[PDB]
Structure formats: C-alpha cells, structure tokens
Amino acid sequence: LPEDPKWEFPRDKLTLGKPLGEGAFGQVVMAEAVGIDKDKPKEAVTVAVKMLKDDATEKDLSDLVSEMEMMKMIGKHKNIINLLGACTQDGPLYVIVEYASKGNLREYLRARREEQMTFKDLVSCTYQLARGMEYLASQKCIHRDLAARNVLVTENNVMKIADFGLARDINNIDYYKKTTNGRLPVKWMAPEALFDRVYTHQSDVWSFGVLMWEIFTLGGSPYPGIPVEELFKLLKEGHRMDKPANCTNELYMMMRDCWHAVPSQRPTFKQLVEDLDRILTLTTNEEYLDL
Amino acid sequence: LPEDPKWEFPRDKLTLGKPLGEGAFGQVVMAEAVGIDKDKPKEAVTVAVKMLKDDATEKDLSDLVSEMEMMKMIGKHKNIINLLGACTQDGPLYVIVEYASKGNLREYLRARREEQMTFKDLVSCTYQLARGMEYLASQKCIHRDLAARNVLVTENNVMKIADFGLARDINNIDYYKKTTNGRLPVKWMAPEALFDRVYTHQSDVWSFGVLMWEIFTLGGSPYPGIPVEELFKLLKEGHRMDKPANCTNELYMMMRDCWHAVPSQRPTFKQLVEDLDRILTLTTNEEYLDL
Numbered sequence A, B: 001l002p003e004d005p006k007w008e009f010p011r012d013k014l015t016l017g018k019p020l021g022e023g024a025f026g027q028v029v030m031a032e033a034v035g036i037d038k039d040k041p042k043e044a045v046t047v048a049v050k051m052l053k054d055d056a057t058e059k060d061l062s063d064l065v066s067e068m069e070m071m072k073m074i075g076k077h078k079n080i081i082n083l084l085g086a087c088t089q090d091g092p093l094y095v096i097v098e099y100a101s102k103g104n105l106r107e108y109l110r111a112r113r114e115e116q117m118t119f120k121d122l123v124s125c126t127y128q129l130a131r132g133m134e135y136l137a138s139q140k141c142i143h144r145d146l147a148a149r150n151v152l153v154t155e156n157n158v159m160k161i162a163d164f165g166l167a168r169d170i171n172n173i174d175y176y177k178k179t180t181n182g183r184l185p186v187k188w189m190a191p192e193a194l195f196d197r198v199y200t201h202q203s204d205v206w207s208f209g210v211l212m213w214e215i216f217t218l219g220g221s222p223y224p225g226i227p228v229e230e231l232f233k234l235l236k237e238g239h240r241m242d243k244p245a246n247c248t249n250e251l252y253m254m255m256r257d258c259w260h261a262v263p264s265q266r267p268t269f270k271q272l273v274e275d276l277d278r279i280l281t282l283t284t285n286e287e288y289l290d291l
Ligand SMILES: Nc1ncnc2c1ncn2[C@@H]1O[C@H](COP(=O)(O)OP(=O)(O)CP(=O)(O)O)[C@@H](O)[C@H]1O
Pocket: A020, A021, A022, A024, A027, A028, A048, A050, A081, A097, A098, A099, A100, A101, A103, A104, A149, A150, A152, A162, A163, A165
C-alpha cells in the first residue's frame, strides 16, 4: 500500500486488545497506542483498531483502504469519529480511530431503557447526528450505512458517526450507482437505492429517518417482526413504520418527511438541523421537571 | 430380551441396506420398512437401523438396549431423532430410527463451506439444538455425547439430536458418576466429568459449547492440532478454544459461558434458548442482503 507519513503510526507503539461490539466478528479491537498524541510522547492512549477479517479477499482490503481514505479526506467534526492513524507498512493493515467508551448507539440506548434517557436526551442525540450528517453532506460525500450500530458514544455522551465502510465521494457525479455486489443494510435503505441502485444525500436522509426511529424506540429494530426478505414487497406497496411511543407527533412527521417517496421532497440535512435545533431549544427551555 | 408390543416391528417387513456414516463402522444402516407407519400399511419407509457390531460383548448389548429404552422414555420433540420401532424377538437386536437424508451435522456443514451456510443459518442450527437439549434436560436426562457427529439433519434442514448411547436418566440422583470404564469423547467433556467423573445437565452445557464451536467452524475439529492425550494437561491449566472466525463476539462469549470453570455458573439450556432466540430473531429481521 502507498506510504503516507502524515497518518502512519509505529506498530511498536501499538498493542492490540479485546474485541469490540457484541454483534461484531472480532476485526475491531480496543488497543493501547503510545505516542499517538503528538503532544504526549510516552503517554499511552486507548484507541480502537479496525483490521481485515481472517481470510480477507482482494476487495475486502480495497474496501478498508477506501474507508480510511474517506476518513482522511472529510476532515474533523465533533459528531464524526476521528481517524488517529494507520499501520500500513511492513504488516497487516490497521486503521486507528478514537475509542468511544460507551459503545454503539444501540447498545447505549438499550442500557438506559444505567442513567436513563429523557425526551430531551433523545432529541439531543438526534440533533447531534443531524449536525454530523449535515457536515458530511456539505463535503458532498454520502455515508450509505447510517444506523444506530454505526454511531458511537463517547465518555461524555457525544454522538459520533462511524464506520465509513460504504461511504462514497460523489463530488464529481452527484449520485452513486453501484453495479457491483455485496451485502447491504436494506432495512436502512431508501427505495431508489434498493430498487434503482441510486444513492444520494437524499438516500442518506431516508436512512437518517430510520435512525431517528431507532433512537426513539431506544435501540429498537426497524420494521419489527418483518423478515428482511419480506420488506421489498412492503416498500413497493408504500409501507412506512408506525410512530414510536416516545416520539412526539412533530418528530414523527419529520421522520415521515425523511421517508417521502420523492427524494427531492425529503428534507435536507441542513433543514433537519434547523428544525431539530428549534425543537431541542424549546424542549430544553420548557420541559416539565420532577421536584 | 423382554417383549414390548408397542414398539416391536415385524422383521419380515424390514429390509437392510447400505452402511451409514463415513466415520462409522457399519453397524448403522439404511433400510426399508414396510408398514412402519401405522397409517400406510403397504407403504415402504426408508429408515435407519442400529445393531450390535460383529463380535458384540455382554455389555455392548446392554448399552444398545439402554439407548433404545432412553429413546422410548423421553418422548417426541422436533429436534430429537425419533425411535420408530425395534426388532428384539427371535433375532438380532435392531433399533429403528427415522432416516435423516442429509447425514450428521459435521458432514452437512463441511459440504456447505452445496447450498452454502449463512450466519443466520448457523444461528438457526444452534438455536434448534439448544431447544432439543432444553427439552432433554427438562426430562432430567443427560446426553453425555453431544457433538456434531451425533446430530443429524433432515431433508428439510431440521436439526436432530441423536445417538443416545451414553445418555443417562438422572431423575433420582441429579448427577451421574461412572466408576466403570469405556472410551469417552474427552474433547467434548467438561473438566468435572473428565477429572471427577461427574456428569450433570451442566456438563451437557459444556458439551453444547463445543458443539457451537463445531457449528461456527463449519464442521471443524475441537482443539485443533492438539492430540487428545495432550488435552488433559491443557484443561487443568484452564485452556479454552479461540473464537471461530464466523462467530460474533456475543456468541463467542456465550460459548465461553458454556465453558465456565464453575458448573453452576454456566448458563442453563433454558437460558441458552432464550438468548439464542433473541439473537436469531434479530439476525433474521436485520441481516444485510446481497441485491
Ligand atoms: N471506535 C470505536 N469505539 C468503540 N467501539 C467501537 C468502535 N468502532 C467500532 N466499535 C464497535 O464495533 C462495532 C463494529 O464496528 P464497525 O461498525 O466499524 O464494523 P465494520 O465496518 O468493521 C463491519 P460492518 O460494516 O459489517 O459493521 C460497532 O458497532 C461498535 O459496537
């Protein structure tokens, strides 16, 4: 793999640890990185390392490189997990990212159904992710795998968009159309992406709506009781998920707006941020309190 | 041998066939049984027949009878192979069981490393076997030989626990302790059964963990590269198998739970079923699909 000193990290200063993610297969691990922080030379930092699975194909590697390059290019944002470095020379490919001590969003929410979640907290999570995606979209890049499992939570409860394994740079085409193959998160995909294989910022918006649903159901699984294979027919029929109990009517309509059948009629992340900010501010300044 | 009309089958209506099982020695054969199905009188049914090996001892017979009686007593369950009848009078002892057209679990999995196995399918196999064992344990009986080689697969891919050659009824003692002898499946045995000769539902749980490992390695052999004789020392040292590549971290921890050094701390089949059901449902309703 090509060299890139800027992000290269000394393997010798990296020590792999335990696997991360209940539903993961062990290719993502915790790890100690000594000197990863330019400032602190001898200070060891707990990080997360992603590598190829035991028996990786040719494309597999190609997909991990892309994930890394995507992270390299988009730049820093408070609501996007940070790339810290990579070990690409004389050894297995390791992509080092900051460690989120509270796991993915789904595990995080399920554990607080232990400081329980309040309506305000749910709106806050949603607002933060809309900001992260607004930023990603402003870079003319699509994520393609927006879901609770791909959102991490820091020690201080900050929302971090992660796993850019399917992310694409659409700066020159304005829309990505795959002709290849591979497993895809169909229950999070917009109809046009599923049926026409067309992805855009608007298809990410659709996925954001599903994410909102996961957040308000506190880590629930989309289209409950519906085998993934049965979803295709339902979508062709215009099926849409019901409103989660913890969701206000206003937020449910926002959810349904994200699922508008016409891509261009769905709100933009810019609009979602503005509406979510209004809703967050009002809730923060008006919520009822237990005395 | 005592008579028992209920299960007795006319030899004249039974015609032995080819041997079954690559690793078997020929004492298990395919066979045609005319009238085995009370309903269909002239309809011939393909079944499996187990008999004593050429040069059977006194105990050998005693062990086949017990196997038959165990099957007679436990009752029917979707995930346990069915006893159809037996030829015990005026001739060699024949134990007739339903035929599983896709062989034992190991052969079945190895052949799909030909409709290949998906993660969901592996969880499904595991779930079914946990159900079978949960049922067996509810009858206060232990299997003592739970392994891929002792699991059969039907034409419609249903998992069937089989070979009750070592099974014991522990309704009156709550735990079986052998003082006799005989060859045992040490690589599938819990430390307390190996070292203290004590067997319980919890030792079957340990064996279930090894079975999970076989399933997720697609018919692999436990403790790879380790001669059976070398295992004893490793176990005394607390050795445990590494996670199979196809296994999620969550399922590996379930595996390790089955191998807890403290028998009572291992999960019960009831708990395994509940956790496996949750995992199976989630996977079925959320898996990524290739379009
Ligand atoms: N930086 C990090 N800190 C903490 N946990 C992390 C983490 N990165 C990943 N994880 C955990 O590992 C899980 C899987 O990570 P990731 O989403 O990057 O997988 P992946 O892209 O390798 C494969 P897939 O695309 O199939 O998920 C996450 O859902 C989360 O639980």
